[PDB]
Design a protein around this ligand. Structure first.
Ligand SMILES: [Zn+2]
Length: 223
């Protein structure tokens, strides 16, 4: 597996990329963010492993930016894998009430802090968590950075295929995607879990991919 990567996306916004091997297919990249706010650091999604989470946190902490919290966008391990490590270090972790209930049901360690409702400000004026409704999973949320107009979309953003439908709600996804598109059409950058970073157009494709999945009711390179 490739080493953890950290790449600048905007002033005070970094994409962290961690990797997981899929059996006989290959390595798949997972994107999250580190957002620097008021000279402190916040994780948007954790890496899959405690090792990568520790590497990521210590990297910023050593250099003078205290880790103040992490928010996980949904219950899947690619978003929550580092919660155990963070809790073990007394670093505040956050996830929605729905996400914590799914973690609990799945026998996974929960975030220390939860929230509910459509909007939740993790940092006032600077980090907003938004629940568009069920889609990729029943609990999926997105994270908005109003100062940079950057949206972390995570697994909800599926411009080129809905992917693993094991936990998806194909019935609700179109309505959720419509709501998200209407809410953050102003986004300059949209960050998906695996696919390439794009512009607000990703919100359109997702929507059309949702409405097209309903009807018909790792990446796939075969063509
Ligand atoms: Zn997922």
């Amino acid at each position: 597996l490739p080493d953890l990567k950290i790449e600048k996306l905007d002033e005070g916004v970094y994409v962290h990329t961690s990797f997981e091997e899929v059996n006989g297919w290959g390595v798949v990249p997972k994107h999250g963010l580190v957002v620097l706010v008021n000279a402190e650091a916040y994780l948007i999604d954790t890496p899959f492993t405690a090792k990568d989470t520790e590497k990521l946190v210590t990297w910023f902490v050593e250099r003078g930016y205290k880790i103040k919290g992490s928010i996980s966008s949904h219950f899947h391990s690619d978003s929550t894998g580092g919660i155990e490590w963070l809790n073990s270090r007394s670093i505040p972790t956050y996830a929605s009430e729905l996400t914590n209930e799914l973690l609990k049901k799945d026998g996974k360690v929960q975030a220390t802090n939860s929230f509910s409702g459509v909007n939740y400000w993790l940092v006032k004026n600077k980090i907003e968590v938004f629940y568009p409704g069920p889609g990729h999973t029943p609990d999926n949320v997105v994270v908005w950075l109003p100062e940079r107009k950057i949206l972390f979309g995570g697994g909800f953003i599926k411009p080129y295929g809905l992917g693993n439908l094991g936990d998806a709600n194909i019935e609700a996804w179109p309505k959720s995607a419509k709501l998200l598109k209407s809410k953050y059409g102003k986004a300059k950058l949209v960050v998906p879990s695996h696919s390439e970073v794009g512009d607000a157009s990703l919100l359109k494709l997702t929507l059309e991919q949702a409405v097209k999945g309903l009807n018909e009711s790792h990446p796939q390179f075969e063509k």
